[PDB]
Structures are given as C-alpha cells and as structure tokens.
Amino acid sequence: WTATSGSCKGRCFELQEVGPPDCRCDNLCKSYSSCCHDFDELCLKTARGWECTKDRCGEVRNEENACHCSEDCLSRGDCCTNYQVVCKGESHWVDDDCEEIKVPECPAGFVRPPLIIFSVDGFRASYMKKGSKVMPNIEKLRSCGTHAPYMRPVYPTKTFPNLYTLATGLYPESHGIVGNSMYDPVFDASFHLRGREKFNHRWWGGQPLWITATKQGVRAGTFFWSVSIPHERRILTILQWLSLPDNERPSVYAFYSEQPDFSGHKYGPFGPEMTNPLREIDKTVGQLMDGLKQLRLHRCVNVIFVGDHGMEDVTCDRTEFLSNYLTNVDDITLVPGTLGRIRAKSINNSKYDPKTIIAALTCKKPDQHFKPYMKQHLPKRLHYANNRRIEDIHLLVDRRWHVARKPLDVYKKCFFQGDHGFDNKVNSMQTVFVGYGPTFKYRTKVPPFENIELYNVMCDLLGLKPAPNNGTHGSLNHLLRTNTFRPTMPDEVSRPNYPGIMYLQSEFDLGCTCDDKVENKLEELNKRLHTKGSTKERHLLYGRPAVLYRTSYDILYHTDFESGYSEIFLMPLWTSYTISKQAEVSSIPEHLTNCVRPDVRVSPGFSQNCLAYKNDKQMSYGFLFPPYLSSSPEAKYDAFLVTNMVPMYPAFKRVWAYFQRVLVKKYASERNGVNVISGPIFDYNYDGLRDTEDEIKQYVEGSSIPVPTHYYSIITSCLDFTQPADKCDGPLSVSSFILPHRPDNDESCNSSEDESKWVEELMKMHTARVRDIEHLTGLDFYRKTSRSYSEILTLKTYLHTYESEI
C-alpha cells in the first residue's frame, strides 16, 4: 500500500528514499506506482520548454517554468543549460577549442572531482566514426579526452547483465544477472524485464559502485531513471544536485539513455532512421557540458561516456526453430532469441535427458546457425557457467540470427530489424568508451579493453577501495593522468625443488618402453649442463611462473624446454619453450613412435605409468613440449620423458598434434620467433578457478593420473616483429587459448575433414586472456621482464579476438 496523499513540495528527486506508506518523490517512484499526487506538477514541469530565448533574458522568476532565465537562476542552480549563451554572450562548450586539463579546477568546497557516468544503451563502437558528423559534442569528448576504438561488453551482450557488470566489475555468473530473463530454481522465482520481481534485491549480487561509494563516505546520486522522465529533465536534476551544499552534494552521478538501442531494434544498427537518435544524444551531451560550464565545473568533473553493448542486423526470417530438430519440443522450456538456454518444462518428467537433446541439436543441418553446448563446454573466455540461474544446456547463436522453440512464438507474441546478446567477441556487439576530465589523459588513444575493468577505475576516480571483482586493478592505469593504482606482484607461495639424478632406470616398473639404448666427454659435459639449466635463458624468457598456492613441484631443465613438474598431479603445471623463426620441424622417428622414458630425476612414485594408458581404452597421451620441434636428434629423447607426458583423448590428439606440428612453426614464421608456455587445466566445477586435488572427477583408469578438462598455451613474441622473440627490447605481443579437452570433436561440424580445415577455427573460438589462464592454474606469468608492471597487467588482460578491423 501507498497512501499517495503526502506532498513532493521541496522533495523533487530526493536522494534518500522514503519507506511506505509515505509517498515517494525519488526518480524511481513512477516505476513502483508510488509517487505523491503532485509529483508531475512539481517535479516534471515542462512549461516553456528547455531553452532560453532572447526575450526570456532577465525575466522575473516564474516557478512554473521547466528551467529559468532570470538573473537569480545561477545561484538557484536551475537555469536552462543554454542560459549564459543566449543571455550572457557565452559560447557553447562544443565551440571552444579544447585545452589540456592538467589539474581539477573546481569551486571552493569540492573535496574531489565529481564523476558523471553518461551511459548509452545499444551504442555500437562504429557509431563514433560513422556518426561523427552529427555528434559534435561526443566527438569533442572523444578527441580531447582518452578514448578506446572500442570496449568489449560481457556475455550475454544484453542490457542488464552489462549495466550491472559496469557497476560491479563482476562477470554476470558472479553478479547473478545472467540475462534479461531468468529462473532461479532455489527461489523458485522468475526475473523478467516487465514487472516487479526484478527490483527484489536477491537478484543483484556483488557490490555496485553506488553502494561502494556510500559505505566509504562518498555520496552518490541515484543511478536509475524512470523511462518517462525526459532526458532534459535528467540533466537538469544532475545539474541541480551539483549546486547542493558541500555536505549534501553527491560526488558520483549517472545518466542513462534508452537510445540509440530503442530505435536500433526497430531499424537495425545503420537504418536511415538512426541519424536522428544519434543527433538527439549528442544534443543531450551538449546540454550537460553547457550546464557544467555555467557552473564552472567543465574542467572539474570527470565524464565517462560508455555504452552497454552494440547492435546487429537481425530479422524474423533469420530464425532457427527447435521444432525442426526435436520431436519432444513440448517437454522443454527455451529462453529464446540471440542466445538459447534450455531446461525441462517439468521437473517431474523422468524421461527428460539433456544428452539426447544435445545430440538432436548437433550439426543437423548444412549451415546450422546455432551450436549447442553443455554450459561447462562453452569457451572459457565467456565465463558463463558458475550460476544456478544459467541452464545446463546453452545455444550459442550465430550473429544476425535468432533461435526460437516453434514458429508460433515468432508470429504470435516483421517487427524488429536489430538485436544484441551474441558472443561478446562479435564486432557488432562492441561498444564505446571515452573518459574526459582532469584525471583522464589528454588526446590519448588506448587499446580496446573489457568493461569488467571499469569498476576499479571508477573507484580510483573517487578515491574508493573497490570490492573484490573480476577486473585486474592496474591494467587500465594507462588511461589516467593521476590516481593510478600501483599493485605489487603476488608473492610466490611454493618454492620449487631442483632435483638431480636420483633414480636408476630399473627402479621404474611403469610398463613403458623405448628403443633408446644406443650410445664421449665432448657431448657428455654438454648434456649435463643442459640438465642443469644452461639453455634456460632461451626457453624461459620472462622468468619462471610463480605458484600462488601450496603444493609440491620440481623444476626440470632440458636442452629445448623447461618445466614446473607437479608431484601432486603427476604432470607439468607448465612447460616453457622458445621456437625461433629459423627452427625446423622434424618427424618422430619410426623406432621412437611409442617411446616413453622414465625420468631419473623424479621418483617412480611421482610418475605416470604406461600401463594405465594401455588399460584405459578411452584415454591416450600426448606431450607438452612436442617431439616435432626438438633441436637435434639427441635432444629429441628428452621430449619422450614420462615427465613431459599428459592424458589426451584420441579425438583431442588430432587438435593438439596439428597445433604442435603445424601452427607453432607457423606463428614462429609470422611473428619472428615465439615463446610458448603450455599446460593442463582442471576446472571440474566450472568456476573459472584452479581445482584442488579433491575436485577431480576423472582419472586415467586404475591410476591416480588426473584428467585435465582443458589444455592452455600462451604464445609470446616481440610487438616490434623486426626483433626476434628471444631478443626483444620493448613491449610484448601475446595470444593464448584454453582448449577444451573433449573425447569427441562434436563441437566442430567439419571434423571429418583434414585438421587444416577445422582446427584453427576451434582454437580461435577458445582464444583466452593470460589472466583467464592465471585464475585457472593459480600461476602468475611474466614475473621477470623489463616492462612496467601495469603494462604487463594490460598484456595479461589482452584478448586476441580474430575479428576483422572495426
């Protein structure tokens, strides 16, 4: 109940909300159907419009007006934003040359530069260039401030998951807003765009920026605006808040625009009807900057112009229907559209089986425009699995397409020409970032980055300590003039052992054989030096990775590679090697085809054994340092050590072998040498974090050899490719992947063909950031370079996307 019989007199857009049955006057009251009777009359005045005119200059205050042009309005803080231009001969902010803002130039009583977040829905990265003629204010923010060519949203590329990621620094799987529509099975409750349940606090996890601010004594303007409040009124309210006394005035503010997303759905991303929404947005920015200028705040406030996601061309005809694949269509519930999430319609139906649903949806039609996954098999870069609200069965939908259950859904519920929600590496989904103000850099372009990074920077701008989040704090220090965050590298938790020769060949009963009993102090002194680490500077270019958890492991040196070998998991945590541009691929000799050799440095008890592989009819093995890339026939024997061996399904061996035989040499050729670090990953609970030993769900049959869920590789070289990878004086370049370790290649519909036709496509899909690998392995890479640590954090957050240029 709301007894709407109180009054909003003096309370218009009050900052502290009042609990019922007192009526509300806050900027969200409309949405709860709870405003005081006089809310519209008092708080939503429109009389005379939004702009001063020559005749209004000097006028007598008439409180009925939407904004004012009287002499007192500056002190009242409620002039129309164009007051000083019309009545005082000032220029519009957009007409003034830009001038570096080296320090905040704030009125007395401002304790810190305010932050204003200007968020625009559906603002596709390419609008900055393509719409530049009609967005002069935005273009000025962009060229004078700090900007990225694009900012990567999170998956799914929907509005609420992205706005709440902006606010929290968390992946949707952690913050809990995993789509625009959701079912939570613990609550037995549904979340929808339309309705009331979405305001229940239990949906919203983590700690959004306005709560972070408040808890640390920094006052926040309310972030949320009712759809019916006109943009001009939103701006005037923020400007009025900025005129409050010091003890009452917020330091952080947000504006939200429903455009261009609203018209983009209707007309598609580049429909001719899209020019006007882009003009109108620019005009709103203009009003803000003019109003800031009037208040002497245009060189004091930090302004962020940021989108939530882009917009793609999508029409009714481009829909895949599950009724064309499944006979059992009415026993499922589908969350439809630019992604698919499937669960059983009834938890009482015992005949429901996810495995037969997946099979019925896998590679069934020539150019099928969606791909089914169990959520734990989705590309790890999406970080989209660790939440009970995300259904076990997921469909990744091709850009430009929708998926739906039955045709009746699409014609009984063409309208739209645009939509979003696709894979967050898709170019059309990319959105914008511009920072302008004293704390941002001047005329500076920065590389694209992910929106999970912004929360940390917004905390930096306000002097706040960020709640724990998925940003890598420091990785965006290069956007900032001051207020950088200077982290220290994590401390190593486990120091390695350096074992020497401690076991005789006959102490090993592993069931392994090798044709290697073929026999010199010239080369005997040489091989001892290699085993002591004489070549380690060539193969370990950035220092050994640090182990950030408690475990027992050994460093093993070889001519061609160095490894950190886990006595607990019985395989390397990492293997590091360098392949120069000049290196040559050899084959595995015939006499060595099935060779596995005990490692005399590592006890039989801490070794894999070949018999388990023989007995395990499903599981085979591969090597982390590949025999193909051995530097010499003698060095090749090191590659067959039992300590270089890892469990691999034969289906996966196809992938791994092509990567090691073909692609590594190819990258060395193209990149002028590469350094490779490869290893296993164990994430059986799909939380994106390293499993402890007691979390492992699968072993090589009859043994304690744990089966990885994924294999990673990190491929590093010189950004200036005129220098070889092993002699690089400047910035690095990296690409990585986290390949799913799967017993079939069902994911790749063309896998019956030669590996040159499908393997690279699979690897591109499973591209990753080094940071993703860090979370998954508890390792910390790039510990010894000549680069600044912030630069290295930026490198670690880099994602190679394989999309063409924006």
Ligand X SMILES: *[C@@H]1O[C@H](CO)[C@@H](O[C@@H]2O[C@H](CO)[C@@H](O[C@@H]3O[C@H](CO[C@H]4O[C@H](CO)[C@@H](O)[C@H](O[C@H]5O[C@H](CO)[C@@H](O)[C@H](O)[C@@H]5O[C@H]5O[C@H](CO)[C@@H](O)[C@H](O)[C@@H]5O)[C@@H]4O)[C@@H](O)[C@H](O[C@H]4O[C@H](CO)[C@@H](O)[C@H](O)[C@@H]4O[C@H]4O[C@H](CO)[C@@H](O)[C@H](O)[C@@H]4O)[C@@H]3O)[C@H](O)[C@H]2NC(C)=O)[C@H](O)[C@H]1NC(C)=O
Ligand Y SMILES: O=C(c1ccc2[nH]nnc2c1)N1C[C@@H]2[C@H](C1)[C@H]1CN(C(=O)c3ccc4c(c3)[nH]c3ccc(Cl)cc34)C[C@@H]21
* Residues labelled as active-site residues: 159
- Which residues between 387 and 446 bind ligand X (CB under 6 A)? 387
> Distance of CA 792 to CAs 674, 786, 797, Å?
17, 10, 9
Q: Say how far residue 71 (Cα) sits from the centre of its chain.
A: 50
Torsion over CA: 770, 772, 777, 780 (sign): positive
Judged by CB under 6 A, which of 153, 206, 310, 622 binds ligand X?
Answer: 206
685 in a labelled binding site? yes
Contact call for residue 772 and Ca ion (CB under 5 A): no
CA atoms within 13 A on the CB side of 46: 7
181 binds, among Zn ion, Cl ion, K ion, none (CB under 5 to 8 A by kind): Cl ion
Max distance between CA atoms of the chain, in angstroms, equals 105
- Which residues between 491 and 550 bind ligand X (CB under 6 A)? none
* CA-angle at 141, arms to 140 and 147, nearest 5°: 115
Q: Which is nearer to ligand Y, 201 or 465 (CB)?
A: 201
625 binds, among Ca ion, K ion, ligand X, none (CB under 5 to 8 A by kind): none
Q: Which is nearer to ligand Y, 206 or 545 (CB)?
A: 206
Adjacent-strand bridge partners of 404: 321
> How are beta strands 339-344 and 332-335 bridged, if at all?
antiparallel
Tokens read off for 630:
């051995």
55 in a labelled binding site? no
Cβ-proximal residue to ligand X, closest one: 205
Contact call for residue 312 and Zn ion (CB under 5 A): no
CB-neighbour burial class of residue 266 (10 A; exposed 0-12, middle 13-18, buried 19+):
middle
282 in a labelled binding site? no
Contact call for residue 774 and Zn ion (CB under 5 A): no
The contact set with K ion (CB under 5 A) reads 613, 616
Segment interacting with ligand X (CB under 6 A) among 82-90, 276-284, 365-373, 464-472: 464-472
> How are beta strands 302-307 and 431-436 bridged, if at all?
antiparallel
Peptide bond into 156 cis (omega under 30): yes
Segment interacting with ligand X (CB under 6 A) among 173-181, 308-316, 319-327, 355-363: 173-181
166 binds, among Cl ion, Zn ion, ligand Y, none (CB under 5 to 8 A by kind): ligand Y
Contact call for residue 161 and Cl ion (CB under 5 A): no
User: DSSP of 51-117, one letter per residue?
Assistant: ---GGGTT----TTSSSB-STTHHHHT-B-TTHHHHHS-PPPGGGSPP----S----TT-SS--EEE
Backbone φ and ψ for 412, nearest 5 degrees, come out as -125, 80
42 in a labelled binding site? no
767 to 786: interface string for ligand X, x by CB under 6 A: --------x-----------
Contact call for residue 409 and Ca ion (CB under 5 A): no
Judged by CB under 6 A, which of 54, 194, 201, 465 binds ligand Y?
Answer: 201
570 in a labelled binding site? no
Q: If we measure between CA atoms, which residue out of 577, 567, 488 comes closest to residue 539? A: 577
Task: Report the alpha-carbon distance of residue 687 to residue 431 in Å, rounded.
Answer: 27
180 binds, among K ion, Cl ion, ligand X, none (CB under 5 to 8 A by kind): Cl ion
Judged by CB under 6 A, which of 78, 173, 261, 691 binds ligand X?
Answer: 173
616 in a labelled binding site? no
Judged by CB under 5 A, which of 31, 143, 181, 534 binds Cl ion?
Answer: 181
Judged by CB under 5 A, which of 78, 261, 554, 747 binds Zn ion?
Answer: 261
CA atoms within 13 A on the CB side of 414: 15
119 to 148: interface string for ligand Y, x by CB under 6 A: x-----------------------------
Contacting residues for 176 by C-beta, under 8 A, at least 6 apart: 203, 204, 205, 206, 387, 389
Contact call for residue 434 and ligand Y (CB under 6 A): no
Q: Which is nearer to ligand Y, 52 or 480 (CB)?
A: 480
Q: Which is nearer to Ca ion, 263 or 777 (CB)?
A: 777
Q: To 10 degrees, what angle do helices 770-777 and 789-797 make?
A: 90
> H or E stretch including 460?
helix 454-461
Judged by CB under 6 A, which of 167, 335, 358, 629 binds ligand Y?
Answer: 167
> How are beta strands 710-718 and 674-681 bridged, if at all?
antiparallel
Q: Count Cβ atoms below 10 Å from residue 658 Cβ, excluding itself.
A: 19
Q: Minimum distance between the CB of residue 28 and ligand Y, rounded to whole angstroms?
A: 8
CB-neighbour burial class of residue 300 (10 A; exposed 0-12, middle 13-18, buried 19+):
buried
Token look-up 């073929």 returns 518
Segment interacting with Zn ion (CB under 5 A) among 65-73, 89-97, 106-114, 254-262: 254-262
745 binds, among Na ion, ligand Y, Cl ion, none (CB under 5 to 8 A by kind): Na ion
741 in a labelled binding site? no
Task: Report the alpha-carbon distance of residue 666 to residue 669 in Å, rounded.
Answer: 5
Residues in contact with Cl ion, total (CB under 5 A)? 3
683 in a labelled binding site? yes
Task: Report the alpha-carbon distance of residue 785 to residue 779 in Å, rounded.
Answer: 16
691 in a labelled binding site? yes
Whether the Cβ atoms of residue 154 and residue 387 lie closer than 8 Å to each other = no
Task: Report the alpha-carbon distance of residue 246 to residue 266 in Å, rounded.
Answer: 44
Contact call for residue 308 and Zn ion (CB under 5 A): no
616 binds, among Zn ion, K ion, Ca ion, none (CB under 5 to 8 A by kind): K ion
Task: Report the alpha-carbon distance of residue 641 to residue 106 in Å, rounded.
Answer: 67
Contact call for residue 453 and Zn ion (CB under 5 A): no
497 in a labelled binding site? no
261 binds, among Zn ion, K ion, ligand X, none (CB under 5 to 8 A by kind): Zn ion
Task: Report the alpha-carbon distance of residue 349 to residue 371 in Å, rounded.
Answer: 25
628 to 667: interface string for Ca ion, x by CB under 5 A: ----------------------------------------
Whether the Cβ atoms of residue 632 and residue 527 lie closer than 8 Å to each other = no
Binding residues: 121, 159, 180, 261, 265, 308-309, 420, 683, 685, 687, 689, 691
Which residue ranges make up the site for Cl ion (CB under 5 A)? 179-181
Q: Given the rule CB under 6 A, which residues bind ligand X?
A: 170-171, 173-176, 205-206, 383, 386-387, 468-470, 687-689, 775
Question: Which segments are annotated as binding site for 1-tetradecanoyl-sn-glycerol 3-phosphate?
Answer: 159, 180, 261, 420
Q: Residue ranges for the binding site for Zn(2+)? A: 121, 159, 261, 265, 308-309, 420
Q: Which residues bind ligand Y (CB under 6 A)?
A: 117, 119, 163-164, 166-167, 199, 201, 204, 223-224, 254, 256
Binding residue ranges for Ca(2+): 683, 685, 687, 689, 691
